[PDB]
Design a binder for this molecule. Structure first.
Ligand SMILES: CC(C)=CCC/C(C)=C/CC/C(C)=C/CC/C(C)=C/CC/C(C)=C/CC/C(C)=C/CC/C(C)=C/CC1=C(C)C(=O)c2ccccc2C1=O
Ligand SMILES: CC(C)=CCC/C(C)=C/CC/C(C)=C/CC/C(C)=C/CC/C(C)=C/CC/C(C)=C/CC/C(C)=C/CC1=C(C)C(=O)c2ccccc2C1=O
Ligand code: HEM
Ligand code: HEM
Ligand code: HEM
Ligand code: HEM
Ligand SMILES: CCCCCCCCCCCCO[C@@H]1O[C@H](CO)[C@@H](O[C@H]2O[C@H](CO)[C@@H](O)[C@H](O)[C@H]2O)[C@H](O)[C@H]1O
Ligand SMILES: CCCCCCCCCCCCO[C@@H]1O[C@H](CO)[C@@H](O[C@H]2O[C@H](CO)[C@@H](O)[C@H](O)[C@H]2O)[C@H](O)[C@H]1O
Ligand code: SF4
Ligand code: F3S
Ligand code: FES
Lengths: 239, 257, 239
């Protein structure tokens, strides 16, 4: 009688919450990569994009209103995703502790015929969480992993994100960490884009191969772009 | 055919088990796996050992009592067949093969290879039926059912309750079994009046029994002896979403006696 | 089993394809006429509109990003429309060849009671195809219908569409061709704007007269708007 909050009670309801949140997060990731593609055009276009994000309909919607609304929606979605992930992972871990040879091995021999989605998805989720924290702390605020006197904060209406990026991916450790995170995110998307359509029930015999192809292409595009950025910055193609 | 077997051996629930090896020098290629186990049991009794215990009633792949994990694959390496149907012409001379029960928290191990699958019965007890009493049924041809709907309902309804889907997925989820029952009852008009409650109840019961969630991996469909497809899980998800939109609340869980 | 591509198999599916394509094409025609109405304001406003087409979502999307997407959608729709029209016209020609007096007639005497839609739609479609071929080659590219040294290509970020328009409709033959094409397109819309709704099945007793009136008004508006241009340019009212 509570209503749509009934999804909190059951495991399938948590999966549905996770699917909707995954829709929002996949949309954000695709749009973010598309916007970040502009760094190849030049520093002028990149800074214009960065400035225009805040002035999204500036005469009518005020300053930074839409960006703050989008940030709030993204935070809510991420928190719901994390909560459902942790709950479901703990529940599925409880289902195996009673009957297992060891705490690290379920069967004496087990051959999988449909992929390793659980391992990849969960480990990639944890890595993506840590990467999100570090990336926000490293490029939005510029207080970690950055030489002193090299970060230019937005001073009024002028943005220097091109300078921050070209001076950000210079330590090889940072670019390696970014590449690892992007590989795991590529696998994450490659499974989740189809999984979220199946979870909501928008799947049958006809559309299964189409959805698999859509997941493949989305994951490949995101992976290619997001590994092209820091590698190009490090090697000097983007200067 | 000379065959080496690694059988899981556990005395009871509390006593821990271990693997034991038995060598069989002569094996008829065309006898089924369970008959090999029977010959091994006869040899063990002759020697003076405790025979291997396993579930078997029909030996036809219909009852669903047989349940074995052979070489890491449920119901043996061949697909779309049960353990009783697995004839060992599909194995190789000198092969070493391991047999284990199902492994789940909701399927306690009772003996060497026998498990407790009463959680499936409890899942059924919580809404997996049509509440019609005897004597009140109308005439058979009162409600028309299209041939396609009846065929899909029969495809979902041919579930032998073996529990290999639970032992297939890493999460230890009974999503395929529950989805098959929900789909079978939801494709006929007689199942309409209480379907949106039904699914919710059933899903809750699974969560109450100790099963995991479904990551949409798909091992269950590849292991299932009756080719129950993933569209059943999509149908269950649609039904549960629709029930949540209606504010349907799960009832009290079915506590075991 | 294949899914939506089942519309390719039957005649009614091809008509549905034509209906959706006609929706897109009617929308484009109306929007294009509305945009071209701006040249009565003056060269400044017309050039501003032409420039702003290539810059939609300037600080979000790239240069000519939405325009190329719209161009691709228009090409896909036009190709589907042509393919379905050719297939169905050939089929209907086959239906009327075994039993017919002579070869250019069907009945010794035949009196239609519901309008000459087939002749109009088919001949207007062929004429519109040829007109589009000439139009893209005339105003977008400027390689035909021009005295040398009169068409100013877009140089950098400036546009001279007003100059090309005022130097385009000077030959009486070209303006007459435009007259004929716009008349035939007016008839085409006057039938199609109702035929699309009937073909998609969104037509009852109540909405038949409403949809017929909507078709009449759309056809008349498009006709008047698109015929006001070449006459004004030729007579010198727009200079
Ligand atoms: C989605 C995913 C994958 C994750 C969610 C992560 C999200 C949504 C993070 C939000 C990031 C965030 C809090 C961004 C706001 C940035 C802030 C608070 C900047 C602070 C800040 C602002 C707002 C100024 O205007 C200003 C002007 C002049 C000098 C300095 C500053 C300054 O530091
Ligand atoms: C019929 C309907 C309804 C639809 C189909 C019609 C369509 C969609 C036609 C496509 C038209 C088309 C190809 C337009 C693009 C115009 C082109 C290709 C211009 C070429 C071109 C470009 C793109 C420049 O940037 C440039 C910069 C500086 C000098 C010259 C040029 C130049 O000539
Ligand atoms: C290596 C490729 C990437 C680069 C170069 C990059 C760069 C940036 C930059 C410069 C900003 C600040 C935007 C601005 O100041 O206007 C930003 C914001 C952000 N990035 Fe990335 N990013 C990359 C990949 C990712 C990925 C894969 C994610 C997803 C996990 C991500 C999540 C974010 C988030 C959440 C923000 C903050 C958005 C906001 O607060 O409005 N980034 N990124
Ligand atoms: C980059 C942002 C992310 C996106 C776009 C994303 C996307 C998805 C999608 C679409 C699904 C499938 C949802 C469904 O089928 O119901 C999924 C599953 C999952 N995600 Fe994420 N995810 C992201 C980040 C994370 C994070 C940060 C974690 C955890 C720390 C995580 C852990 C999981 C887990 C555990 C699952 C499977 C749930 C299960 O056990 O069944 N993901 N993800
Ligand atoms: C200016 C762009 C055009 C628009 C907006 C347009 C619009 C329409 C519409 C709305 C219909 C009726 C759709 C239906 O009832 O399913 C239609 C039918 C038709 N159009 Fe077009 N059309 C255009 C160009 C063309 C072209 C270029 C051709 C052929 C070369 C053509 C030939 C036809 C034919 C032959 C039919 C009817 C065929 C049948 O009913 O089987 N049209 N058009
Ligand atoms: C006499 C009335 C018309 C005028 C004054 C006119 C004006 C123009 C001008 C100046 C251009 C070149 C600028 C550009 O490339 O965008 C153009 C292009 C074009 N016109 Fe027209 N036009 C007329 C009729 C039509 C009609 C009725 C249609 C609809 C079928 C049409 C479809 C197009 C298309 C598709 C382009 C190319 C746009 C592009 O993809 O770049 N024109 N029009
Ligand atoms: C960044 C913010 C997010 C991180 C912090 C939150 C994550 C930490 C929580 C760990 C899990 C505890 O979360 C809690 O899980 C239990 C049991 O799994 C759920 O419990 C409920 O659902 C489960 C199955 O879904 C059923 O047993 C039953 O319906 C009910 O007990 C609670 O609804 C949830 O609140
Ligand atoms: C420019 C764009 C291309 C221009 C047109 C080139 C193609 C010519 C189309 C004419 C032939 O049309 C092509 O063959 C037949 C009809 O003959 C259609 O085929 C269909 O026809 C009818 C349905 O209407 C059915 O009876 C038939 O079984 C089915 O195959 C094809 O799907 C179509 O592609
Ligand atoms: S769904 Fe398949 S594997 Fe699971 S119990 Fe039923 S028949 Fe066995
Ligand atoms: S394999 Fe397991 S994760 Fe779900 S889809 Fe089947 S129960
Ligand atoms: S013993 Fe009955 S299904 Fe195998």
């Amino acid at each position: 009688m509570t209503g749509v909050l009934t999804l909190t009670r059951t495991s399938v309801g948590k999966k549905v919450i996770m699917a909707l949140t995954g829709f929002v997060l996949v949309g954000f990731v695709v749009f973010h990569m598309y916007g970040n593609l502009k760094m190849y055009q030049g520093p002028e276009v990149y800074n214009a994009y960065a400035a225009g994000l805040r002035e999204l309909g500036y005469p009518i919607f005020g300053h930074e209103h839409l960006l703050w609304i989008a940030r709030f929606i993204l935070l809510a979605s991420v928190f719901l995703h994390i909560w459902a992930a942790t709950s479901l992972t703990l529940q599925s871990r409880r289902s195996l502790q009673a009957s297992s040879i060891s705490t690290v091995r379920r069967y004496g021999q087990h051959k999988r015929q449909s992929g390793y989605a659980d391992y990849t998805m969960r480990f990639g989720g944890v890595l993506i969480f840590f990467f999100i924290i570090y990336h926000i702390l490293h490029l939005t605020f510029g207080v970690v992993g950055y030489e002193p006197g090299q970060f230019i904060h937005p001073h009024g209406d002028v943005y220097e994100t091109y300078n921050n990026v070209v001076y950000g991916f210079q330590n090889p450790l940072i670019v390696g960490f970014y590449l690892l995170t992007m590989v795991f995110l590529a696998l994450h998307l490659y499974h989740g884009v189809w999984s979220m359509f199946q979870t909501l029930g928008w799947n049958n015999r006809t559309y299964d191969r189409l959805l698999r192809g859509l997941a493949i292409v989305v994951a490949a595009a995101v992976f290619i772009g997001n590994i092209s950025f820091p590698l190009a910055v490090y090697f000097g193609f983007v200067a | 055919m000379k065959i080496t077997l690694k059988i899981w051996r556990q005395k009871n629930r509390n006593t821990p088990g271990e693997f034991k090896t038995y060598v069989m020098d002569n094996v008829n290629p065309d006898m089924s796996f369970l008959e090999m186990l029977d010959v091994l049991n006869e040899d063990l009794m002759s020697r003076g050992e405790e025979p291997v215990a396993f579930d078997h009633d029909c030996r036809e792949g219909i009852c669903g009592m047989c349940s074995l994990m052979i070489n890491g694959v449920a119901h043996g390496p061949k697909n779309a067949i049960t353990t009783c149907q697995l004839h060992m012409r599909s194995f190789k001379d000198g092969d070493t093969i391991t047999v284990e029960p199902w492994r789940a928290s909701a399927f306690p191990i009772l003996k060497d290879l026998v498990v407790d699958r009463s959680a499936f019965d409890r899942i059924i007890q919580a809404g997996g039926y049509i509440s019609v009493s005897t004597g009140s049924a109308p005439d058979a041809n009162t409600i028309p059912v299209s041939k396609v709907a009846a065929d899909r309902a029969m495809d979902a309804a041919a579930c032998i309750g073996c529990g290999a889907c639970v032992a297939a997925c890493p999460n230890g989820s009974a999503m395929l079994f529950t989805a098959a029952k929900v789909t079978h009852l939801a494709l006929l008009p007689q199942g309409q009046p209480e379907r949106y409650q039904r699914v919710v109840n059933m899903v809750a019961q699974a969560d109450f029994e100790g099963f995991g969630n479904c990551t949409n991996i798909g091992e269950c469909a590849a292991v299932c002896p009756k080719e129950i497809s993933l569209e059943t899980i999509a149908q269950l998800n649609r039904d549960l979403v629709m029930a949540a939109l209606r504010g349907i609340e799960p009832n009290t869980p079915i506590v075991p006696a």
